[PDB]
Amino acid sequence: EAAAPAGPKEFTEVWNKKAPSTLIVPEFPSNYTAVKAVGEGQVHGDAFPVNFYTPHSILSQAQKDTVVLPGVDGYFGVKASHVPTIAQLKPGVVELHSGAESEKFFVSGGFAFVHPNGVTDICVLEAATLDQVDPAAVKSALAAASAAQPTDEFEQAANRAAIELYSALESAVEAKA
Amino acid sequence: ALTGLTVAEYFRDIEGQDVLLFVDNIFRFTQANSEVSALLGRIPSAVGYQPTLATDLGGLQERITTTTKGSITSVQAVYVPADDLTDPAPATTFAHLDATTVLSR
Amino acid sequence: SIAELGIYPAVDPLDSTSRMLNPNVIGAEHYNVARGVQKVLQDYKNLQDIIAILGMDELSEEDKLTVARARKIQRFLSQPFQVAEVFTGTPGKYVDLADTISGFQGVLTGKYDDLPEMAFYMVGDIKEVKEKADKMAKDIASRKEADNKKVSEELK
Amino acid sequence: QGVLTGKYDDLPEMAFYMVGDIKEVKEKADKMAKDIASRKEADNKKVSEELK
Amino acid sequence: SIAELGIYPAVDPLDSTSRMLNPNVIGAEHYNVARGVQKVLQDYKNLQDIIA
Amino acid sequence: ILGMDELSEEDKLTVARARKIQRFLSQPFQVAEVFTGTPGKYVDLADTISGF
Amino acid sequence: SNQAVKQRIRAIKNIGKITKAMKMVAASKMKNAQIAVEQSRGLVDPFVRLFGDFPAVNSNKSVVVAVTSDKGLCGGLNSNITKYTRATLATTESEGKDVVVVSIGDKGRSQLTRIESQRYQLAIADTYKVRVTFGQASLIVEELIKHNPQSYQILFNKFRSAISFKPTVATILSPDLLEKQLEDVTGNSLDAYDIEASHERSDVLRDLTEFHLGVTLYNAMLENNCSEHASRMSAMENSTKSAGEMLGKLTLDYNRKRQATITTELIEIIAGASALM
Amino acid sequence: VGLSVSRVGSAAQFPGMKQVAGTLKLELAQYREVAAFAQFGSDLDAATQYVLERGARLTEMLKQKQFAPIPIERQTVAVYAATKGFLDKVRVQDIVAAEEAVISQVNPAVFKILKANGKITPALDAHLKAELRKVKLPGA
Amino acid sequence: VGLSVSRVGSAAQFPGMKQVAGTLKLELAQYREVAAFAQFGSDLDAATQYVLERGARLTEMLKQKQFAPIPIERQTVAVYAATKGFLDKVRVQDIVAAEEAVISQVNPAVFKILKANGKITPALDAHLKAELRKVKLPGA
Amino acid sequence: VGLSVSRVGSAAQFPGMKQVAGTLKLELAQYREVAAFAQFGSDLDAATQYVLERGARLTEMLKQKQFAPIPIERQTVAVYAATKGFLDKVRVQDIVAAEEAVISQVNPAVFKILKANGKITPALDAHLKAELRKVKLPGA
């Protein structure tokens, strides 16, 4: 049931009647969004558009053919037309593929959507590629993390996040192929 | 400046040529005539120039013309006092200028 | 400079004086609104170079009120004359004294802060501000009403 | 030389006003900071009562 | 201008001059603190326009 | 304050015309070839109008 | 007399120098803080591609944020946002609801605590003091989910160009309160997505709308900072041309008073000498 | 146009020119309210683009070259074509050509009618507006 | 106030006004000190905004009408009531009204003993601070 | 510097100074046009901050105490040591041991050669650049 249809078209009339007529109607982030979810397209075969995102940088916006993402239930590959999903991610390696060649960014968390028009959206807070990490620091940081376990369970939640991320990173650096 | 105008006026009126006349600092002509009329006891006009400023300038600047036998053209260096174009000596001199060549640093 | 604004008669409100501007001759209700109008116009004159070199964008909202009210009460000193109607065409306006005192109390207290500035220009009373303010809002709406064409008059 | 090189940035700014030596700005700061430490009691037994 | 700030004696510290203000006359230690006070006062006089 | 890269192509075409226009206003004089070697040019008015 | 207009000319001349310096300081600050704005523009659109854009919802508790600037030479920006803030705040208030109004930047607290002081619970300043980062926006968003509203209206200036700064309103719905319900049509529009997370969808949507509030708040203050620098770059340009027109008028007035002074002093001397000669 | 006055010869104006010159200088008067802040001063509202691109065409209508003075009946026809909106579609760059095309293309009977009657009579505005739509103004 | 000087200063005025007027002269210097810093609205640390009302209340205290001079004891009561407390909870708009509340409603016997002493004795300072709290100030 | 002229100019200066001071007056002019930015906190694009620190050390280069004039070969060397980039680009706690340290620590043979030849030859700016790098300032 959708008898109360909020939206950019349906904010405009209540604004034009209530707000003063000197002002132009305020913009919306939907006006700056060119591609959407429900309206189909964007696949045209074996390609599908991958938008890999961080708050500080836009890591990829090209089209790919498979991406493997570290979900909470383990890794999973997204082919050209996956089922629509909202997959929470755990610390692991996001791997893009455009063909024979691949780029592997290690991520810290985040989510990953793929939409009913086949466009996928990987939304993480910090993604550093495996060249940028040195393995001598993650071993000592996990040693300092898996040692001190305070009884204040906020800090043990932070410790669990630490040992999860550092352990998946350590397994992510001997996993060269 | 009248001596220079006479030597140019020979080449205009007799030789029948197109003469240049370089009056280096028409302002110093104005300033010298201001000093002369102050020494003759005359009352200065506006800011301190001679009362006869327009006609002392026009005595020079009206003999620089094209006649039926020749012409005198005149490139006059202009000094502007206190960076003020409305000072009456450049305001009077600019009334006679037909062009302006500004050399910049 | 007041005449270069277009405000006629170009009476400087802060350079004109009278010995009748005294509460013991004109009464305190006239004297207080006159001194209030002079206070607002001086307090706008004190902002005149800040508004020039910075703009109105940065002023305090208790002073942007002062600037708008003084831009109103210095258009409300403008008045069409019966002798100036031959070279302007706008008819003359004689304003009684009590009309001016009530009309200048109203802009001071804030009873006309919604009317635009140009609604006060070259009108007689504060009543005629109201019939000019809405006539400015017909004529921004009468742009989109009709498409006037004239037919079948070549045989008239 | 003290106020120039910076020995006396720990004194308040109006402590230097209408004083003598450098030994008087230091104690005018003490009087100013005992007096801005004071004026905190306001209830009663001040001069305003009548049987005082 | 100094007296409108309530600072008395209203001596302009910059516009005042003396023949004795020489490092050979009153000593270089006095001369350098005098020139340093005038330096910081001229710098503040130049900074007031961007402060306002 | 911004840069020549953000300019329009017609707001770089006026720059590319004006630089060679102000270069084409230069002229070597006949009275300077005594001590600068480059011979001097006398340009006619007909050449000047067409060349600009 | 003729000394006051000389030092006034000097004052206006140095003010013109100051504002011409501030113009290109803001030009440099806009040129470097523009790439960060375009980089942060990417992450806001997967959520509006997923959750959509629902400004005209009916909520009962709503937090409205006006993203303003800190320094006050922006030239018509923070006043524009406090216009649009109450212009959309009166548009979506007709239900007898609760509203918390928050400002980012203390020039918002100087402008919002006099226009809605009944509803103003939070003032957040010093945000641009070094740079805006995502953890900073995350802490601000956690202070916003300290209250438990049903919606979040975010008011900011989108850096459209170096001259145009479109003021936008971005809306974030609370998960269990309106997010599942504003997607209901013929079932639900979110049921096409297969949740691959740990717990149930009432926590996935909680994490997603907290993330979405933080992301749009990061992009809000980042876009608003770039438009604040770009409008200061134009306001200081107008200030230099105004203090140049004022200098060009006051120099003519000085030259007139200069010529008048030389003439009247010389007329005094001649009048004193003609009485004796 | 703001500072210049002539209030004695305003009674002694050519009628017809007096009819159109009222809305001419009123349109230029509200054009002078758009002076140095079209998008120079602070911003743009862009609803007064009509008075901006109208006052520009009224300004370049009144430009005139040297040593060529215009008869009054051809001036009032040119400013009638300017201020009734008959040159509203023409771009700003060729109104100098548009108004001389108006003078050369509109048939010279209406100039004699306007000079002899001395006013834009109700018989004359109809034939003037019929003549003013059938001319080819350059550009556009 | 900054430009009007006097050579005698003290020793030639009322002693009771001399107690209460130096703290007015210097406080108006503080009030003028912040007027060139009131065009922005930063309002530093409740100091440059507190004296911005305190001195503004003092300059409203100093206003008076024409042909109506005040006796000196009523002036040094009315400026006692301003540079001390008793008026900071009053709007700047109506201190000229609040001063007649201070002058009239206070017992007219404190004026006689302030005139006859010449200064504000601590015996009289107590009753003066007492009767400056009993009156009704109209500020709302 | 900007208002002091000499209409004779470079035709009558030291030829060893003429090839060093032509840089000096140019970058002093560049420092004079960028003179408001010295009082700013927001650093600009380091083509202006470079000329800001350079012009500041150049104005501090031309300071001079009274009744102690300098020979022309020593001024040339001290200006060469600030226009060629041998500047105190350290923190400036060592103003006390670096202004005079250049002319006191280079060997005086370069002064004899520069005075007798009147020009910094390619055979002498080599030794002067080699001498300028080995300046001690051992107070640090």
Chains G, J in contact, 3 or more Cβ pairs below 8 Å: yes
Q: Which two tokens stand for residue H124?
A: 């004359």
G67 CB burial (10 A radius; 0-12, 13-18, 19+) = buried
Residue H93 and residue H78: Cα distance in Å, rounded?
17
In the DSSP assignment, the letter for residue A24 is: P
Using alpha carbons, select from J8, B26, I1, B83 the residue that is nearest to residue G254. B83
Largest CA distance in chain F: 46
Residue C4 and residue H1: Cα distance in Å, rounded?
12
Residue J15 and residue J7: Cα distance in Å, rounded?
17
Q: What are φ and ψ of residue G101, in 5° steps?
A: -110, 130
**Burial letters for A132-160: b for 16+ Cβ neighbours within 10 Å, e otherwise?**
eeeeeebeebbeebeeeeeeeeeeeeebe
DSSP of E1-52, one letter per residue? --GGGT-SS---TTT---SS-STTTT-HHHHHHHHHHHHHHHHHHHHHHHH-
Amino acid in the structure at residue A73: D
A65 contacts A79 by C-beta, under 8 angstroms:
yes
Q: Given CB atoms, is E36 within the 8 Å cutoff of chain D? A: yes
Residue H82 and residue H89: Cα distance in Å, rounded?
11
J40 contacts G20 by C-beta, under 8 angstroms:
no
Q: Which two tokens stand for residue D33?
A: 């900071």
Q: How far is E7 from chain I (nearest CA, A)?
A: 12
- CB contact under 8 Å between B86 and G256, yes or no, is yes
Using alpha carbons, select from C121, C147, C141 the residue that is nearest to residue H29. C121
> How wide is the angle at C-alpha C76 spanned by C-alphas C75 and C79, nearest 5°?
95
Residue F3 with chain G: CB contacts under 8 Å: 31
E: neighbours with 3+ CB pairs under 8 Å?
Answer: D, G, I, J
How would you write G188-207 as a 3-class SS string?
Answer: CCCCCCEECCCCCHHHHHHH
Residue G234 and residue A93: Cα distance in Å, rounded?
46
Residue B21, classed as helix, strand or coil, is strand
The CA-atom distances, in angstroms, between C140 and each of C127, C143, H23, J125 are 21, 6, 17, 79
- CB contact under 8 Å between G266 and B82, yes or no, is no
- CB contact under 8 Å between C55 and G246, yes or no, is no
Residue D9, classed as helix, strand or coil, is coil
Q: Given CB atoms, is E3 within the 8 Å cutoff of chain D? A: no
Taking the CB of residue C75, how many other CB atoms lie within 10 A of it? 21
Q: Which domains does chain G have, with CATH numbers?
A: 1-24+236-277 (1.10.287.80), 25-235 (no CATH)
Taking the CB of residue J37, how many other CB atoms lie within 10 A of it? 20
Residue I36 with chain E: CB contacts under 8 Å: 52
A19 contacts G91 by C-beta, under 8 angstroms:
yes
Nearest CA in chain I to D49: I126
| Rg value, chain I, Cα | 16
Among H39, H42, H45, pick the best mutation site for testing chain G contact (most G Cβ within 10 A).
Answer: H42
Paired sense of beta strands A66-71 and A92-97, if any? antiparallel
Contacts of H116 (CB under 8 A, 6+ apart): none
Residue G43 and residue A54: Cα distance in Å, rounded?
6
Does residue A8 have a cis bond before it (omega within 30 degrees)? no
| Rg value, chain D, Cα | 17
Residue I10 and residue J34: Cα distance in Å, rounded?
52
A40 contacts A116 by C-beta, under 8 angstroms:
yes
Q: Which two tokens stand for residue B51?
A: 């009362």
Does residue C9 have a cis bond before it (omega within 30 degrees)? yes
Beta strands in chain A, from DSSP E residues, in sequence order? 48-53, 58-60, 63-64, 66-71, 74-78, 85-88, 92-97, 102-107, 111-114, 120-123, 127-129
Residue B53 and residue B43: Cα distance in Å, rounded?
12
Q: Which two tokens stand for residue A44?
A: 């045209």
Residue C79 and residue C129: Cα distance in Å, rounded?
12
I134 CB burial (10 A radius; 0-12, 13-18, 19+) = exposed
The CA-atom distances, in angstroms, between C43 and each of A119, C40, C77, C112 are 62, 5, 17, 19
Residues forming a β-bridge with A97:
A66, A102
Q: Which two tokens stand for residue G83?
A: 């216009």
Among all residues of H, which ones are annotated catalytic? Answer: 7
Q: How far is I36 from chain C (nearest CA, A)?
A: 11
Residue G65 and residue G44: Cα distance in Å, rounded?
17
> How wide is the angle at C-alpha H91 spanned by C-alphas H89 and H92, nearest 5°?
130
Name the one residue in this structure whose structure tokens are 């050519």. Answer: H14
Using alpha carbons, select from E3, E7, I26 the residue that is nearest to residue D18. E7
The CA-atom distances, in angstroms, between J28 and each of G24, G265, H137, I47, J53 are 21, 40, 59, 44, 11
Residue H84 and residue E23: Cα distance in Å, rounded?
84
The CA-atom distances, in angstroms, between I86 and each of A79, I16, I52, I126 are 80, 18, 17, 14
G47 contacts G212 by C-beta, under 8 angstroms:
yes
B92 contacts B54 by C-beta, under 8 angstroms:
yes
Residue I104, classed as helix, strand or coil, is helix
Kindly name the residue from I7, I54, I91, I133 that is annotated as catalytic: I7
Q: Which two tokens stand for residue H81?
A: 């074509």
Contacts of A89 (CB under 8 A, 6+ apart): A69, A70, A71, A72, A107, A109, A110, A111, A112, A122, A124
| Rg value, chain J, Cα | 16
Residues forming a β-bridge with J107:
none
Q: Which two tokens stand for residue E34?
A: 């005098």
Amino acid in the structure at residue B38: A
F: neighbours with 3+ CB pairs under 8 Å?
Answer: G
The CA-atom distances, in angstroms, between J93 and each of G59, H55, J63, J90, J104 are 64, 65, 17, 8, 19
Sign of CA dihedral G137, G140, G141, G142: positive
Residue C69 and residue C38: Cα distance in Å, rounded?
12
- CB contact under 8 Å between B82 and G258, yes or no, is yes
CATH architecture of C21-145: Orthogonal Bundle (1.10)
G100 contacts G133 by C-beta, under 8 angstroms:
no
Q: What are φ and ψ of residue G165, in 5° steps?
A: -135, 90
Amino acid in the structure at residue C102: S
Using alpha carbons, select from D36, D30, D29 the residue that is nearest to residue D13. D29
Task: Label residue A68 left, alpha or beta by phi (over 0 means left) and psi (-120 to 50 means alpha).
Answer: beta
Resolution in A: 3.0
Q: How many residues does chain G have?
A: 277
- CB contact under 8 Å between D47 and I122, yes or no, is yes
J: neighbours with 3+ CB pairs under 8 Å?
Answer: E, G
Q: What are φ and ψ of residue G3, in 5° steps?
A: -100, -25
Residue D33, classed as helix, strand or coil, is helix
> How wide is the angle at C-alpha I120 spanned by C-alphas I119 and I124, nearest 5°?
135
Nearest CA in chain I to E49: I36
Q: How many residues does chain F have?
A: 52
Identify which of J36, J42, J44 has the shortest CB distance to residue G18. J36
Residue G224 and residue I139: Cα distance in Å, rounded?
42
Contacts of C36 (CB under 8 A, 6+ apart): C104, C108
D32 contacts D15 by C-beta, under 8 angstroms:
yes
| CATH for H25 | 1.20.150.20
Residue H56 and residue H94: Cα distance in Å, rounded?
12
Residue A119 and residue A102: Cα distance in Å, rounded?
19
Contacts of F44 (CB under 8 A, 6+ apart): none
Residues forming a β-bridge with G159:
G165
Residue I64 and residue I58: Cα distance in Å, rounded?
12
Q: Which two tokens stand for residue C24?
A: 């013991």
Residue G250 and residue I110: Cα distance in Å, rounded?
57
Sign of CA dihedral D14, D19, D22, D25: negative
G53 contacts G91 by C-beta, under 8 angstroms:
no
How would you write chain J as a 3-class SS string?
Answer: CCCCCCCCHHHHCCHHHHHHHHHHHHHHHHHHHCCCHHHCCCCCCCCCHHHHHHHHHHHCCCCCCCCCCCCHHHHHHHHHHHHCCCCCCCCCCCCCCCCCHHHHHCCCHHHHHHHHHCCCCHHHHHHHHHHHHCCCCCCC
Q: Which two tokens stand for residue C34?
A: 């006159």
Residue F1 and residue A169: Cα distance in Å, rounded?
45
A53 contacts A122 by C-beta, under 8 angstroms:
yes
- CB contact under 8 Å between G76 and C54, yes or no, is no
Q: In what order do the strands lie in the sheet with A102-107?
A: A74-78, A66-71, A92-97, A102-107, A127-129
Sign of CA dihedral J58, J60, J65, J66: positive
Q: Give helix I15-32 / helix I51-61 axis angle, nearest 10°.
A: 130
I32 CB burial (10 A radius; 0-12, 13-18, 19+) = middle
Method: cryo-EM
Is J74 annotated as contributing to ligand binding? no
Residue D28 and residue D13: Cα distance in Å, rounded?
11
Paired sense of beta strands A63-64 and G165-173, if any? unpaired
Residue I42 with chain G: CB contacts under 8 Å: 72
> How wide is the angle at C-alpha J130 spanned by C-alphas J126 and J132, nearest 5°?
115
Nearest CA in chain H to G233: H42
Amino acid in the structure at residue A17: K
Contacts of B44 (CB under 8 A, 6+ apart): B34, B37, B38, B50, B51, G266, G270
Residue I125 with chain D: CB contacts under 8 Å: 47
Domain containing residue H130 = 14-140
Q: How many residues does chain H have?
A: 140
Sign of CA dihedral G60, G110, C61, C56: negative
- The question of whether I7 is a catalytic residue gets the answer yes
Residue C31 with chain I: CB contacts under 8 Å: none
Paired sense of beta strands A85-88 and G194-195, if any? parallel
Residue B99 and residue B80: Cα distance in Å, rounded?
16
The CA-atom distances, in angstroms, between A46 and each of A36, A41, A81, D16, H81 are 19, 12, 8, 81, 64
Paired sense of beta strands G151-159 and G165-173, if any? antiparallel
Contacts of G239 (CB under 8 A, 6+ apart): C53, C54, C55, G15, G16, G19, G23
Q: Which two tokens stand for residue A126?
A: 């910090």
G209 contacts G175 by C-beta, under 8 angstroms:
yes
I77 contacts I98 by C-beta, under 8 angstroms:
no
Q: What are φ and ψ of residue I52, in 5° steps?
A: -65, -20
Is H66 annotated as contributing to ligand binding? yes
Nearest CA in chain H to C86: H11
Q: What are φ and ψ of residue A89, in 5° steps?
A: -105, 145
